[PDB]
């Protein structure tokens, strides 16, 4: 019974693939590379639903010009199980069938092939076809081919990761990045930077990544998603080094730039790292997130962790770290939570500063469950050195004195901030009125 | 007005028995046993015994089940006789009787399905509202949140279709009790104050208790101007308060700035909310927030203040007030900065223009993020 | 109850008097307009779907 429904699904998917190829052809003809990006928005939906029957019929009809590509693509595809009602899907008619297929359409077909060979736990054949595709793309040189090439590199990286051979492709990615940054592509450059950062992280090679990021320049016109990936990797690399505040800022930018609905795992990743970094900064992250449904059970370790950091109890901190230890290690953060464990005092000292405008050092020692007040003295001095607190120590009376509040408005800060925002708004308008196309004479 | 079914006194006593420090009260236990024996709630007796590991009085339960079966069979027979010849009304009367008995004996699912069947058979908007109010009440007895929200939406839709306004005000009281339940104290205060002159839902609680809840929530949700212009002046809240010296003193102490007596009152109100069934969940938030509010009231008219002076005004020590003040300044609530070397509490309360500037930055940043996202999304 | 303007100073037994414009009535209007156009952007988004 379900076979007929599957058949109708296959027919509608075949028509949909026809539509994507039509869009790519229009883009290639009309000198509008962005028109492919329409063709490249529904890839996840297609992959989540593709089927062998659809793939066979598509490769059969579309590759009318029987070329070595066809001989390399068909054999992997399973043939129909004694199909009798075959309609012989024939997208290419007359001249179109005879003429060679467009580079972009062929690249897109190879992309569907590699995706299907990825969904199935069949990585060797997928990797083979992917190397072939990479060779093909590198051989050619075209614009809409470049736009598809972006996702082709993404999928080449995905397959190489699924085969755990991430190192071996570093040079290919590097040369591809070089050619891209030489040829003035934007999305390709963003993709190849992001992939290089992912490769560098996979092997915790942070110093090399730091040099790379510090030397290359992110093009200012990427997607939301490639911006999110770049921002996450830069945030992670900083947090691994000691520049906490910038890591916090870049992370929040990323979390504010991610897709709203999908990317549950991505949100999980950024949120856990944000929690850890803020904790490392002496602030207290807000409790609103922890009860969100998409991140409720994925952060319980961090919920207990913050419950511990506030009411600092090294017994409780050790209990929670030990129990949920393997998990922390799995996340890829353990090192940072350890960096916290010896900074549990900082929250308390920042609290003491916020609450009191001047306190005796002995009172601090009593409040922090410390030894002789010299230890608290030293911790406070180091703090003010770090910049976490604004104060001035004065022992001749024996009290640390917080600094008054300065009037931000009277200064010129407001002018600067509003100027930046005004510039952004005018730029939005110029872009918006530029994007218009009046083609009624199309 | 409407039948006292389910007796939410029963919900209150069940809760009280639930607390470890009230499990062993002979008077309360005997009162509940009398209630069960008087209304013969066999399923309720079984659920109680199960939860409490109470020895089952088989001798009594035998006759309990016997009578239950007798009444059930009688009601089904009356329904059959009505449906045989009688059309509508009498059949609806019998089905209402079945649902009512089922709810009385405490049988959740039986009474619930019966009320649903009555509703579907019922077309009288007054009777539809009676049914919905019964369903809300039973959803309260079992704290059935999903049932409660569904029933409230259903009632709102029927009432929006148009209905007797007595039932509108009854819906207001039910919504207010619910908002009290779910720690949305502001709506609770608003509805309770609006309906202070039209409390017809006596099945819920005594009028004294309705006003006590209204005052309790008003002093935490409203401000001093509104508090004066509603609570302390109102003819009603005063007329009733002639029989509740405690709540009257509690309110007036906060308002007149008798702080020591106000704390002495809040002490016992903590207990009067821990022992309660609808407030106990938020018994440690209400008192704490009220402490915030008093602290920010005393400090609303003092650039400086000696911690000794705070103590003598509150009749507490110095270490205690220091602890609480530092805690709440941590929480990011109160606006002041303690100084310990000299006991001064100098205020820091923020400027108006700067606050407006900061809020403009935050809100505009949110909006710009959205507009950028929207500009990008058109092409990808 | 905002009868007049100022605040005491305990301990020192002083009574300060001043004059404050607590609000400016040109930033409040701006904030309300920002909220209103947040609602308008939400509406455009809800109307951006048709494009997909």
């Amino acid at each position: 019974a379900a076979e007929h429904s599957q058949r109708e699904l296959d027919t509608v998917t075949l028509e949909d693939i026809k539509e994507h190829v039509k869009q790519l052809e229009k883009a290639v003809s009309g000198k509008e590379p962005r028109f492919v990006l329409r063709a490249l928005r529904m890839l996840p939906s297609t992959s989540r639903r593709l089927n062998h029957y659809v793939l066979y019929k598509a490769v059969q009809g579309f590759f009318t010009s029987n070329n070595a590509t066809r001989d390399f693509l068909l054999p992997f595809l399973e043939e129909p199980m004694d199909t009798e009602a075959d309609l012989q899907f024939r997208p290419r008619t007359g001249k179109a069938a005879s003429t060679p297929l467009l580079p972009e359409v062929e690249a897109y077909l190879q992309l569907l092939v590699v995706i299907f060979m990825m969904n199935s736990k069949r990585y060797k054949e997928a990797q083979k076809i992917s190397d072939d595709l990479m060779q093909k793309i590198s051989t050619q040189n075209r614009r809409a081919l470049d736009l598809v090439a972006a996702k082709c590199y993404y999928y080449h990286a995905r397959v190489y990761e699924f085969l755990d051979k991430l190192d071996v492709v570093r040079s290919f990615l590097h040369a591809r990045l070089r050619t891209a940054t030489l040829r003035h592509d934007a999305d390709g450059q963003a993709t190849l930077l992001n992939l290089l950062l992912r490769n560098y992280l996979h092997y915790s090679l942070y110093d090399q990544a730091e040099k790379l990021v510090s030397k290359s320049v992110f093009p200012e016109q990427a997607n939301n998603n490639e911006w999110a990936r770049y921002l996450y990797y830069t945030g992670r690399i900083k947090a691994i080094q000691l520049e906490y505040s910038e890591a916090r800022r870049t992370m929040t930018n990323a979390l504010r730039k991610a897709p709203q609905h999908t990317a549950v795992g991505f949100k999980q990743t950024v949120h856990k790292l944000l929690i850890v970094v803020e904790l490392l900064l002496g602030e207290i992250p807000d409790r609103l997130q922890f009860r969100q449904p998409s991140l409720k059970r994925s952060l319980m370790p961090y919920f207990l962790l913050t419950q511990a950091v506030r009411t600092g109890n090294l017994a409780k901190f050790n209990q929670v770290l030990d129990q949920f230890g393997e998990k922390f290690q799995a996340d890829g953060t353990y090192t940072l939570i350890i960096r916290l464990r010896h900074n549990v005092i900082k929250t308390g000292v920042r609290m003491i500063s916020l609450s009191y405008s001047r306190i005796s050092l002995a009172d601090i020692a009593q409040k922090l469950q410390l030894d002789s007040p010299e230890d608290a003295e030293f911790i406070v001095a180091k703090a003010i050195r770090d910049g976490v607190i604004e104060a001035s120590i004065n022992h001749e009376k024996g009290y640390v004195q917080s600094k008054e509040m300065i009037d931000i408005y009277s200064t010129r800060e407001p002018q600067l901030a509003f100027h930046q925002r005004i510039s952004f708004c005018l730029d939005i308008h110029n872009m918006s009125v530029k994007a218009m196309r009046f083609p009624p004479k199309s | 007005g409407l039948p006292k079914n389910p007796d939410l006194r029963i919900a209150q006593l069940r809760f009280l028995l639930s607390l470890p420090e009230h499990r062993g009260d002979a008077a309360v236990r005997d009162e509940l046993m009398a209630a069960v024996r008087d209304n013969n709630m066999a399923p309720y007796y079984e659920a109680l015994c199960k939860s409490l590991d109470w020895q089952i009085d088989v001798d009594l339960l035998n006759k309990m089940k016997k009578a239950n079966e007798d009444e059930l069979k009688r009601l089904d027979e009356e329904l059959e006789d009505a449906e045989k010849n009688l059309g509508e009304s009498e059949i609806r009367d019998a089905m209402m009787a079945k649902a009512e008995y089922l709810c009385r004996i405490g049988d959740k699912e039986g009474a619930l399905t019966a009320f649903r069947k009555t509703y579907d058979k019922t077309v009288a908007l007054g009777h539809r509202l009676d049914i919905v109010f019964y369903l809300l009440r039973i959803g309260l007895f079992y704290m059935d949140n999903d049932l409660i929200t569904r029933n409230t939406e259903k009632a709102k839709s029927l009432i929006e279709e148009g209905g007797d306004w007595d039932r509108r005000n009854r819906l207001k009281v039910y919504q207010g009790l619910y908002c009290v339940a779910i720690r949305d104290f502001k709506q609770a205060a608003e509805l309770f104050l609006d309906t202070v002159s039209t409390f017809t839902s006596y099945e819920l609680m005594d009028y004294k208790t309705f006003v006590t809840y209204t005052v309790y929530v008003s002093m935490i949700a409203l401000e001093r101007p509104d508090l004066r212009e509603k609570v302390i002046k109102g003819a009603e809240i005063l007329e009733v308060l002639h029989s509740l010296p405690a709540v009257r003193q509690y309110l007036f102490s906060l308002y007149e700035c008798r702080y020591s007596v106000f704390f002495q009152s809040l002490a016992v109100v903590e207990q009067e909310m821990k022992k309660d069934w609808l407030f106990a969940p938020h018994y440690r938030y209400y008192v704490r927030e009220m402490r915030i509010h008093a602290y920010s009231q005393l400090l609303e008219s003092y650039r400086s203040l000696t911690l000794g002076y705070m103590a003598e005004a509150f009749g507490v020590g110095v270490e205690f007030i220091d602890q609480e003040l530092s805690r709440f300044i941590a929480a990011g609530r109160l606006h002041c900065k303690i100084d310990k070397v000299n006991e001064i509490v100098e205020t820091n309360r923020p400027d108006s223009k700067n606050w407006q500037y900061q809020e403009t930055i935050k809100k505009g940043d949110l909006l710009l993020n959205r507009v950028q996202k929207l500009s990008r999304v058109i092409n990808m | 109850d905002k009868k007049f303007h100022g605040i005491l100073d305990q301990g020192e037994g002083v009574l300060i008097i001043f004059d404050e414009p607590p609000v400016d009535k040109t930033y409040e209007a701006a904030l309300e307009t920002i909220q209103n156009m947040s609602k308008v952007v939400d509406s455009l988004y809800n109307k951006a779907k048709k494009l997909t």
Partner: peptide, 30 residues
């Protein structure tokens, strides 16, 4: 700043309307 925000929103709305009109014209034409 408020003025510029207003203007940006209006121009974006105009772009969206033009895009929708173009899409509708293409779909009707196709």
């Amino acid at each position: 700043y408020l003025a510029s925000l207003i203007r940006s929103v209006v121009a974006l709305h105009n772009l969206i309307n033009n895009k929708i009109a173009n899409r509708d014209a293409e779909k009707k034409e196709g």
